[PDB]
Design an enzyme around this catalytic site. Structure first.
Site, PDB file in Angstrom:
ATOM      1  N   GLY A 150     -32.680   4.988  28.989  1.00  0.00           N
ATOM      2  CA  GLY A 150     -32.567   4.837  30.442  1.00  0.00           C
ATOM      3  C   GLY A 150     -32.253   6.163  31.117  1.00  0.00           C
ATOM      4  O   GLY A 150     -31.685   7.090  30.493  1.00  0.00           O
ATOM      5  N   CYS A 151     -32.594   6.249  32.395  1.00  0.00           N
ATOM      6  CA  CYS A 151     -32.359   7.464  33.179  1.00  0.00           C
ATOM      7  C   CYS A 151     -30.891   7.786  33.353  1.00  0.00           C
ATOM      8  O   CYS A 151     -30.467   8.920  33.124  1.00  0.00           O
ATOM      9  CB  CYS A 151     -33.071   7.398  34.539  1.00  0.00           C
ATOM     10  N   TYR A 152     -30.085   6.796  33.728  1.00  0.00           N
ATOM     11  CA  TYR A 152     -28.648   7.058  33.923  1.00  0.00           C
ATOM     12  C   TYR A 152     -27.919   7.422  32.625  1.00  0.00           C
ATOM     13  O   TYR A 152     -27.133   8.373  32.615  1.00  0.00           O
ATOM     14  CB  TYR A 152     -27.947   5.876  34.577  1.00  0.00           C
ATOM     15  N   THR A 154     -29.100   8.941  30.124  1.00  0.00           N
ATOM     16  CA  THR A 154     -29.477  10.322  29.788  1.00  0.00           C
ATOM     17  C   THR A 154     -28.536  11.326  30.463  1.00  0.00           C
ATOM     18  O   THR A 154     -27.989  12.213  29.805  1.00  0.00           O
ATOM     19  CB  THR A 154     -30.937  10.615  30.176  1.00  0.00           C
TER      20      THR A 154
END
Lengths: 345, 347
Positions: A150-152, A154
């Site tokens: 996921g982006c968050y 990361t």
């Protein structure tokens, strides 16, 4: 030789960004990588230009239906659906086909945690596509399966792992992360409309309900022997791209020790840039690059460690991670197609 | 109760000054003749017209900006010192002492001399009634005052988010605040870092790890509601919006959500500017822009044993000029809500 690549979910933001990166990849320029089938759940028969007017070299490509038959006969398949569930589809493809899943289905290692947050049976786990995490690069080399983070998580894991691995902060962490709206995906809802988003900020999915919460916990648990807890608050802001994660935890350690831990962790990591002393990250500096910019500090009065991380949610947070991991899977130079230079202002 | 109040605005050309003027123009005492707008001053630009600085204020566009000097500010019953980032102790000392002096800056906000000197690098000037009427005990200090220290914008959001939980002793006194802000809170002095091309499409934390001067101001307001030792981790984040603050505020808790909600009910049920979100709703800065409202929601993260309070305000209204006007109303014996809408201008 040559590597034929399919992208499922080609009409979404992650799909578009994978395609942008593949077009600029040296393996594409020299013929070692071919862009094959581009698929979507709806809009089959439409041309790519109707979805991604920035991708003019592929504007003429006709979008095909997402089905196992269409995706077969490719050496690599991106399942470019960060918000979708690709377990059913993935099971229909060969173990020898490189599958890079942008979605969540193969990220988690605990079936009970999966069931609690996603409300379905656990599909399993694949090597996590965050090469900078300790041990992750080893797992990715020669893999035929990648679960893109996921982006968050990361941003939060890059901000926090060096301090926690070095046992320099407490394992109760707080993350408040602002994000541009592309992280929410391309499905039209009134809440994601420009008029709504522009000039407004709002926290959402607060107090532990956001599905990225256990994902942050899992990554942090892997670097410590202690019970990890994560308070994670995402905040939507009026930008198209970017995540700026503000990450805190109590500490007894001096700044010099914490700084040294980050220098050691990231000094030979090509995508991770530790800010010079007195500088702080900004999302503007990383947009369109696969970079993460990181700074650390200690609030002495509050006995609190502060780590700031900026990434492009669509690049290091999604498509860049996917390509980076693909490079590792295929034995290509990790940095191929992946610039560290942001497109600013 | 006031009946003819002639008001000056020093620092009229900045954002706070412009917003005070917007609110005064919309105030019922302006319309009925009781509140009169006098001298509008700035440190430079004397001789320019107000419209050259604030084209939205067309009823006053023709006013000529005067120098910020005591002589010009004389003969006004109230003076707004509309410089949130300035130090107005020297100027305030020069005004006739019977004047209602409303300082948007920091010089009279803090109550600890050592804390002041540490963060501001000068001798403490003292303190005036803090212009946050909803804080326990604050409203009583403002009624009939001739001195108001307007709160900083970030402390306004953080204190409204956190004080009821702490007053009830339902959270630990070590608090974390990460607050996103539109760029008008940084003021109107032109710097590269505040240029549109720079700010648009970008977010950045700044003055982190306790160096931001609003940190001790949050601590002070919290220390007023508990005997426990308070600590504040405060991180401000600039985002690509002109206005608004969304403060995400956290602290450890082992208290049931229902007890926390009860503390917020106690604090805010009779406060017209403070809106507690319906169940399943969360604040957004878009909903409060151009209003004097704060929208607040609270939650408990059980796995993390963490209380979460979200507060949205317009930094220029409830965070600055609206606070000033709200406090002015109390000073003058006028209805507290006069000139101050709870309705936002959205989208």
């Amino acid at each position: 030789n040559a590597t034929k690549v399919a992208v499922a979910g080609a009409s979404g933001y992650a799909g578009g960004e994978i395609l942008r990166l593949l077009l600029g990849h040296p393996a594409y320029a020299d013929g070692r990588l071919r862009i094959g089938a581009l698929t979507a759940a709806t809009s089959a028969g439409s041309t790519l230009g109707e979805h991604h007017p920035h991708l003019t070299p592929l504007a003429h490509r006709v979008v095909e239906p997402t089905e196992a038959a269409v995706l077969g006969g490719h050496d690599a398949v991106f399942l470019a659906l960060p918000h979708g569930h690709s377990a059913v589809l993935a099971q229909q493809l060969s173990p020898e086909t490189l599958i890079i899943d942008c979605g969540a289905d193969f990220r988690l290692t605990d079936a009970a945690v999966w069931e609690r947050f996603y409300g379905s049976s656990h599909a399993g786990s694949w090597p996590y596509g965050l090469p900078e995490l300790p041990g992750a690069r080893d797992q990715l080399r020669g893999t035929r399966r990648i679960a893109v983070p996921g982006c968050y998580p990361t941003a939060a894991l890059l901000a926090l792992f060096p301090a926690l691995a070095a046992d320099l902060i407490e394992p109760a962490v707080t993350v408040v992360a602002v994000s541009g709206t592309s992280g929410a995906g391309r499905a039209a809802t009134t809440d994601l409309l420009g008029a709504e988003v522009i000039g407004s900020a709002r926290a959402y999915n607060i107090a532990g309900v956001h599905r990225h919460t256990p994902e942050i916990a899992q990554g942090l648990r892997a670097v410590t022997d202690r019970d990890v807890s994560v308070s994670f608050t995402p905040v939507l802001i009026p930008a198209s791209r970017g995540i700026l994660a503000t990450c805190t935890a109590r500490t007894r350690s001096p700044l010099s020790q914490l700084r040294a831990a980050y220098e050691k962790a990231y000094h030979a990591e090509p995508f991770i840039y530790l800010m010079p002393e007195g500088q702080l990250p900004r999302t503007g500096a990383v947009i369109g690059s696969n970079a993460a910019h990181i700074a650390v500090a200690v609030d002495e009065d509050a006995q609190t460690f502060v780590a700031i991380a900026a990434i492009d949610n669509l690049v290091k947070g999604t498509a860049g991670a996917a390509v980076q991991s693909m490079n590792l899977a295929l034995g290509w130079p990790e940095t191929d197609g992946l610039s560290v230079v942001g497109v600013a202002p």
